Amino acid sequence: NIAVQRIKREFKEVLKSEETSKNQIKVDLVDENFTELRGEIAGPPDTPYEGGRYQLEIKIPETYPFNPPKVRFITKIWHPNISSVTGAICLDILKDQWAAAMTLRTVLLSLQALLAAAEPDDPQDAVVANQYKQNPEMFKQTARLWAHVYAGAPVSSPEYTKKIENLCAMGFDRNAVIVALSSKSWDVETATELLLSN
């Protein structure tokens, strides 16, 4: 890691940040060479991610800082700019609006800002972005359910929970069941048809 001096310094900057002191962001070491880090960000209040905490995989590519760190959500999340399957992120500063002087703290706060406001014009996940536009209320409840199931947020829809339980009772994988129902407007018939398609 040729950039190791800088990553160590930016790591320490997050550790000492005001935003870490306010439990908004944090970072942890993964490998002993600082080429992989684990970030975490708080769901903003008055969003469906409130009360949740989201862990982030941060990999530093050999071409950093000319190319950006590669960041993905470890914690599953329902958001138009994040893949509901992989955690991959679509965000300007992580692709062609990256500037070499940007810091790890900036990246973490940009992601927390993304949770406050989606950019559905430039989505990662077309299914989620479609729902966000076409049925904002179901989008909100679906995001809240994922924040409860995956990110530790308080309880969500008991009706969504019962649909998930019913399909898990057929023996389908829980995560597959959640994404099938969330992707099919919580319609048990069509989510089950998706599950049977693989």
Partner: protein
């Protein structure tokens, strides 16, 4: 032996079967009891759609086990 067959609306029926019955035989028993044509039936167990040619024993489906009936969609 008896097994249960449950539909997506939670309605449950009881079927008398043999461990050596094929899933094709089971679909026919469901037709005899409920009137649903075999060609419209899909039976699910342990998160998998069952194949017509295998037996209940092959799938470890045993007494008082529950199979899930998912009818084919209009299309």
């Amino acid at each position: 032996m008896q097994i249960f067959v449950k539909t997506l609306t939670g309605k449950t029926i009881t079927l008398e079967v043999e461990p050596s019955d094929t899933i094709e035989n089971v679909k026919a028993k469901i037709q005899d009891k409920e009137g649903i044509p075999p060609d419209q039936q899909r039976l699910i167990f342990a998160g998998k759609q069952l194949e017509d040619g295998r037996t209940l024993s092959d799938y470890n489906i045993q007494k008082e086990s529950t199979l899930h009936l998912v009818l084919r969609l209009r299309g």
